[PDB]
Specification:
homotrimer; OB fold (Dihydrolipoamide Acetyltransferase, E2P); five-stranded antiparallel beta sheet; 5 strands; 43% strand; RNA-binding; Y-box-binding protein 2 (chain A); rna binding protein/rna
RNA sequence: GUCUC
RNA sequence: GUCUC
């Protein structure tokens, strides 16, 4: 869980996230490239949802690490470290 | 490079605008074919960057590259321009 | 310019033909080095512009230039010609 | 767990 | 000619 750090505190827009499969892609607002995001990377989840998720089109803040199969998001939160909004496909508690 | 099919319809799966490549899913064979920026024949006239967009229907020829099938002469259906990526600014 | 390493194998991370530069990730140290189009020693004869291509394996020396570690005498593995970039048109 | 419930 | 066609 110690993967090299390529960039820190990057702002991105969730392109899409699939709750069933537990991954999606965030598009970096600076470079407009996609970054793979797994459901385990989400640090400050929506407290009203049990499952970890981000929702399509949501603004998120994160670090980029060199993952096992490419660049990966980690430490994903809302802007300024607030909880994410979560996917509308992730059920509320 | 040998021609494997002409005038096929496919759905763009994703396209990376920072480095200019993505993949198309052919609607007949459901295989994936690589698409490079340089293979787009009829680009969106309103955008400077040459690109295609996720989910877009495109029409293309398919050739055999080193590492797999590649799209070429890529257009929108009927030869009209592609829509291009949401991540490529308009002029 | 002082030499930091000779005969390094690396993988092109990206190379922009329009601006004439890119980065190579060294296969031994996994560090990035800058490469300018003037540093390519064995270009692909069948492309007009000088370039290397995304994901290609290159062999080079590492010098320290004005703005950081820099790649020089860039060839393909063993000194053969590089493959070059898809963005560099073929003759 | 790399282009979708 | 130091993170982009």
């Amino acid at each position: 869980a110690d993967k090299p750090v390529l960039a820190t505190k990057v702002l991105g827009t969730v392109k899409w996230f699939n709750v069933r499969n537990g991954y999606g892609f965030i598009n970096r607002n600076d470079t407009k490239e996609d970054v793979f995001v797994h459901q385990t990377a989400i640090k400050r989840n929506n407290p009203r949802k049990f499952l970890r998720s981000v929702g399509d089109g949501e603004t998120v803040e994160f670090d980029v690490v060199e993952g096992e199969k490419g660049a990966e998001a980690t430490n994903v939160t809302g802007p300024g470290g607030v909880p994410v909004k979560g996917s509308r496909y992730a059920p509320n508690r």
